[PDB]
Amino acid sequence: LVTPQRLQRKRQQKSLKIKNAQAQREAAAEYAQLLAKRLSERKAEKAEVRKRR
Amino acid sequence: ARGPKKHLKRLAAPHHWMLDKLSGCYAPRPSAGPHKLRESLPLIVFLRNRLKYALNGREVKAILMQRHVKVDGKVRTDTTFPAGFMDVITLEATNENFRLVYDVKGRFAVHRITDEEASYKLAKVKKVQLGKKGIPYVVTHDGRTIRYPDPNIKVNDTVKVDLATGTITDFIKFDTGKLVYVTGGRNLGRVGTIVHRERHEGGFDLVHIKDSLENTFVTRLNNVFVIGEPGRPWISLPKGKGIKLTISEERDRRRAQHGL
Amino acid sequence: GISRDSRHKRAATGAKRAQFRKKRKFELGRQAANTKIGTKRIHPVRTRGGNQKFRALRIETGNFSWASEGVARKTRITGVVYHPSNNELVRTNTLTKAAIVQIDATPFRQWYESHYGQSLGKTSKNTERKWAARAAEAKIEHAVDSQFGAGRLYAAISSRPGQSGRCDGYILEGEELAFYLRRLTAKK
Amino acid sequence: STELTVQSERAFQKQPHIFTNPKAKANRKTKRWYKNVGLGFKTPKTAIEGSYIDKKCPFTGLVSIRGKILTGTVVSTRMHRTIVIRRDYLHYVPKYNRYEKRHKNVPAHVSPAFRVQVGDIVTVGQCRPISKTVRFNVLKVASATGKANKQFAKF
RNA sequence: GAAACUGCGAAUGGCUCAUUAAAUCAGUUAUCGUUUAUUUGAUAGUUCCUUUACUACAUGGAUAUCUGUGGUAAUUCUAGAGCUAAUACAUGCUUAAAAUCUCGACCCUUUGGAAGAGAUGUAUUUAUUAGAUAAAAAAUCAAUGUCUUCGGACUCCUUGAUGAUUCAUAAUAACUUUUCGAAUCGCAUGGCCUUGUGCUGGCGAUGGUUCAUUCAAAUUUCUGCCCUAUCAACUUUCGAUGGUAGGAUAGUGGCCUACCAUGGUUUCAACGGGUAACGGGGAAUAAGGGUUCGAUUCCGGAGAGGGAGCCUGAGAAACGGCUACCA
RNA sequence: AGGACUUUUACUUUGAAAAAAUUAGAGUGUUCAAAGCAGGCGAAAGCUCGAAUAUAUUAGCAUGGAAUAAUGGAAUAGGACG
């Protein structure tokens, strides 16, 4: 039977799924930016090694 | 036996639960959980025996059921939960917080440790792998699977889980000259500094450890848990700091520090 | 009841081992699939730890891959012509892994025609420019063209119909095909 | 004891899932896959450019070397693609404080990359169960001859 | 809150030592050779397929319990009839964007470059590719890419782990009698006012794919067993040792099949026979060395009268589970 | 921390390992003891030290030593270095 509590559960499930997906994509973006920063740092280090040598 | 075994006779329980060889035929078998049962510690043992807050099984059941035990920020209402090494046990009653660290005799000693640092936990990295969709992840000794770790975190390393969000806060890189703890064998509870780590191509790494008293031993790498930098441990080490005083030195401690 | 334990075998020395224990369930072996051709009939079997296995007796069509340009197509198996283990399976048309079968070969044919259009056996400007960029690089070897004119391709199955339930494999091509023709010419 | 034909049997002999593209015009010999078993063990050049197949090759086959490393002496090289190694040792009887010469016969699987004969001391390594009795793969022929390196005498 | 359906355990525990002499077992390894309910930590938009016509404010039918009629001498024997439910059995819906692949209504003379259209979650199976890495410069033809401040420069290329991998993982083409992707429960029921049953909304409980972790389970390396030669050769047509391919296995493996090779153990005692032999931790005994015992309080193994066979499950060849033979 | 070659052992020192119970053995007035892993001390107003150690003589792993015991180099130089 259709009950406001059942609709509440359905809405909660949908919202939890959407929020979890958003959080996962945000974490992926943050990890990508961290990788880019580390890559820039070690590329600068490699350039300095090439220049000094 | 055809299938899993679900009973632990009292003599077969580890000598670190260090129960009474009489007054019972069986011993609490730890349920499946974050730690090996040989290395873990059931909550019933920690409360009934170590703390004496309870008296027997029913009292421990009543304690756990009403949600006063909090293992690493979670309730864990099962009697034989394997609260293992470096886990945090919180009792809002008596507002007390414990962290399980071996005392140098090699046993899960009762370590009353402050609320402020009880927020976080330490962990050893046991695996670093790449799960589905190319997502890096790290498996600690608790079995915690931390997703998206720092790119230069390697195996055998140590990490500082915030224990609230359950994400990575800081980490310590394994290398020589570093404060370290031991979690197996004769050197249980010992704390020292890594002097050398001989590789031994083909398996079973070994590390040499020198403690503050300038004593030296050697232990397996699986057996090793980096705990911080010398002079600056990242946690509150228990009483004695794991120096492993000699039996004669322990006798001298009993004689000297003595007031009745 | 078919056991695969080492106890019933004699020792390396040759002594006859006495029976140590009656054979267990984690040592069982099941009946051979000995699959056939026609009227797809796959039977599920519940093995250890769930993990449905699929017996693929009486299988007619399956996926087949071409390694050179690397394209896979669903196509019909039409009989088995060679088996490296037992020719009795060939005579009984039993289809197991590594068996050598014939292929209807049409889907590869009009894929080639819509991909290069070389009219084996003997438009929009975009497609024409794609073909020009290809620049007749489709110089695939002569024997596969010979059986393309024949119409039946020579494929070697690589999936295990006994376990997987599928019927996947790859066309003999390159020196591979050569070798097997020699063996087939030995049969011929 | 090795056939001249690179495949002699009914089934074709290929290294599984390494494919040489005939449509390409490089026209090298083939695409031969290989690996190093580690432990500072040098892969033989006869395996690096060889044309054998040997599914159970530690250097070219699927089998991996892990576990025990045993040094012994060849006692039987005259059963196909496999070796029988005599390992000698001394068992210590303590009631007499005396030792006792003893020997065990370890079967193993020597790759065609190695040329073995009766009497060569051999370093062998553990692997998966290959046959009913062989569990070791020959990893090094230390003494190719031992005392037959110099044979003739012409002053 | 009976009963019954559902779920879970019943494979733990307890007992005995009959079988078993490289068998079990002990110490020590390995699984880059596999399955793993549960516990713990994470984990998924795509179920649309041409989306300009659908139940998602909730899809269908049975079915026990029960109401009544019986049968048999009886058994935890149950046939017929009548309703009835689900986290039982079946179906099935949303739902974004993005990017990547593929196929083109055209133009304008090349550096060709573009309207636009379909597919892509995961799961399975098969092919192929990436998964790098000892170190400074070139010329050159062949192909042809960016910018051109029309000389030509190409400077930038990202790559984890182990000792090792075809590993982890990613990518392309496809495949599937198409697995999963919450139609499930409890408490509290707050906030927004778009003031309506409207929009949202917390703490849990069960589930649920995958990957880990744990309880494990299977195999597995080296070495170790009592007496006996009045047991010296043993094994292979019926697998004995190895090769290859296949089948089966959860997985390696003569584990089984097909075709080959004729091999494997042995005076360092193999093979056979005996054990009033389960192995061990241990017990008695005690100058030292030892001798005897260990069915039994712990760890392993095996068995449920002797034998075989099997359903259910994650786990049984279970026996206070079934099938058959023998007693 | 990397390529490079590693004569191989037997032997012996040290260490990691050899589950608990058992044996040994430390502390402890179970009234003593067999035992047990307990207990002790406050003013009585919660404060406490414990639950020690060793051995297993085999097999495996690491490690220092190089006497004793064995094997191997260069005799056709196909030997070693640049």
Ligand SMILES: [Mg+2]
């Ligand atoms: Mg039992």
Ligand SMILES: [Mg+2]
């Ligand atoms: Mg016997």
Ligand SMILES: [Mg+2]
């Ligand atoms: Mg590849």
Ligand SMILES: [Mg+2]
């Ligand atoms: Mg893979």
Ligand SMILES: [Mg+2]
């Ligand atoms: Mg095979």
Ligand SMILES: [Mg+2]
């Ligand atoms: Mg006995």
Ligand SMILES: [Mg+2]
């Ligand atoms: Mg008996």
Ligand SMILES: [Mg+2]
């Ligand atoms: Mg016994």
Ligand SMILES: [Mg+2]
């Ligand atoms: Mg008896």
Ligand SMILES: [Mg+2]
């Ligand atoms: Mg028992």
Ligand SMILES: [Mg+2]
């Ligand atoms: Mg049984």
Ligand SMILES: [Mg+2]
């Ligand atoms: Mg009876």
Ligand SMILES: [Mg+2]
């Ligand atoms: Mg079950």
Ligand SMILES: [Mg+2]
């Ligand atoms: Mg039975």
Ligand SMILES: [Mg+2]
């Ligand atoms: Mg009974």
Ligand SMILES: [Mg+2]
């Ligand atoms: Mg029973």
